[PDB]
Design a protein around this ligand. Structure first.
Ligand SMILES: [Zn+2]
Ligand SMILES: [Zn+2]
Ligand SMILES: [Zn+2]
Length: 148
């Protein structure tokens, strides 16, 4: 039952403001503005996975700015962008460990009653939402194929 990402971002905004941590505050504010943009423009309420997509795009855009700054010799500016990325990445999940993936697979097999390679789709359909972008699906496939 982790705190919703929207609430983690708002709490971190309040703390960064009280800390007078200027760069951190500014980047959190931009994440919250990107969330508001989607909720107004798409007429939806974002969940955690939606917010993770918001953060992933912000990290991508800043990573492309790092590329441009570093190609121009402006490491000082690329470092500011890296500091922004580090703030954003605080809210992102860690990749699943090998042992974590193996456990998800064994749980997916137990609950789906999977037996044999014909049940590859049955298992992967259970796993795919649970794995998100936290593991290589091809490797997960191969681990599942082994057990089946
Ligand atoms: Zn923090
Ligand atoms: Zn920046
Ligand atoms: Zn977290």
């Amino acid at each position: 039952d982790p705190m919703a990402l929207i609430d983690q971002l708002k709490e971190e905004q309040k703390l960064a403001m009280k800390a007078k941590d200027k760069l951190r505050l500014g980047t959190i504010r931009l994440a919250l503005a990107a969330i508001k943009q989607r909720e107004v423009d798409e007429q939806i309420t974002l969940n955690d996975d939606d917010i993770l997509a918001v953060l992933t795009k912000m990290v991508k855009q800043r990573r492309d700015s790092v590329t441009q700054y570093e190609a121009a010799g402006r490491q000082d500016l690329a470092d500011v962008e890296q500091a922004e990325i580090t703030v954003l990445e605080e809210f992102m999940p860690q990749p699943l460990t090998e042992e974590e993936v193996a456990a998800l697979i064994e749980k997916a097999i137990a609950e789906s009653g999977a037996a044999g390679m014909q049940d590859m789709g049955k298992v992967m359909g259970v796993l795919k939402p649970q794995i998100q972008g936290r593991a290589d699906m091809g490797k997960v496939s191969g681990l599942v194929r082994a057990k089946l």
